[PDB]
Design an enzyme around this catalytic site. Sequence first.
Site, mmCIF file in Angstrom:
data_model
loop_
_atom_site.group_PDB
_atom_site.id
_atom_site.type_symbol
_atom_site.label_atom_id
_atom_site.label_comp_id
_atom_site.label_asym_id
_atom_site.label_seq_id
_atom_site.Cartn_x
_atom_site.Cartn_y
_atom_site.Cartn_z
ATOM 1 N N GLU A 138 -10.533 1.315 7.145
ATOM 2 C CA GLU A 138 -10.625 1.116 5.678
ATOM 3 C C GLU A 138 -10.435 -0.374 5.387
ATOM 4 O O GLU A 138 -11.200 -0.967 4.611
ATOM 5 C CB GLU A 138 -9.753 1.974 4.865
ATOM 6 C CG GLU A 138 -10.159 2.368 3.432
ATOM 7 C CD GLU A 138 -10.211 1.244 2.445
ATOM 8 O OE1 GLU A 138 -11.092 1.045 1.645
ATOM 9 O OE2 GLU A 138 -9.190 0.503 2.526
ATOM 10 N N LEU A 162 0.829 -1.200 0.000
ATOM 11 C CA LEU A 162 0.000 0.000 0.000
ATOM 12 C C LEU A 162 0.867 1.256 0.000
ATOM 13 O O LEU A 162 1.800 1.364 0.810
ATOM 14 C CB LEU A 162 -0.902 -0.108 1.261
ATOM 15 C CG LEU A 162 -2.098 -0.997 1.226
ATOM 16 C CD1 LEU A 162 -3.213 -0.450 0.333
ATOM 17 C CD2 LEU A 162 -1.739 -2.405 0.757
#
Length: 186
Positions: free
Chosen positions: A30, A22
């Site tokens: 999230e 990420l």
Amino acid sequence: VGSLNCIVAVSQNMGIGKNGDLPWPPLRNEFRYFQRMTTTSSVEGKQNLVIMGKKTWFSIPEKNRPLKGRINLVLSRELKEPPQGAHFLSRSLDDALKLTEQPELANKVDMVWIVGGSSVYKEAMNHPGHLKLFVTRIMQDFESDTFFPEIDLEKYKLLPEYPGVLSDVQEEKGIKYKFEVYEKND
Ligand SMILES: Nc1nc(=O)c2nc(CNc3ccc(C(=O)N[C@@H](CCC(=O)O)C(=O)O)cc3)cnc2[nH]1
């Protein structure tokens, strides 16, 4: 098998990964959203099927690699067998979707969620029929090396609201994000 969906978390520059991880700091709630979305099931089967690319698979921490409570299918042409922890393997999407209605999965599966590979996203979006895109808009620029395909607003309509999805802006670790869902029928 029910519905065909794609889920993604994209930054401002449309980045989805940086060196097989990420682009942004881990965002818990999230990740929570990613989880509930792909896991909750119902009609047409019992469990959701998660379709992902080779690199996507390896992009997930080993700790929770086989995404718990979902049927995990890896897409690859190189692999001869599903990686350790993985349930099924396929050569392509059209191969993976066909699989979903043969004995083995037909009854068992509800929703199919595409969760990884720009190439998988690209092809899925192109897949003819009814499809929905669940997009998390990370409201900042992050250094990326892999990106999400451009969404053709000429076919994908952003829905005003979706039950279970917060429509106002979120914030975690000083990062503000938004949830969006687009639908198409091609
Ligand atoms: N909206 C969204 N957010 C993401 O982070 C995301 N990531 C990918 C691809 N990469 C990954 C990497 C790891 C895990 C993972 O370890 N998932 C746990 C999350 C649970 C929690 O941490 O509270 C999972 O079990 O689903 C999932 C996706 C695909 N679509 C996404 N879509």
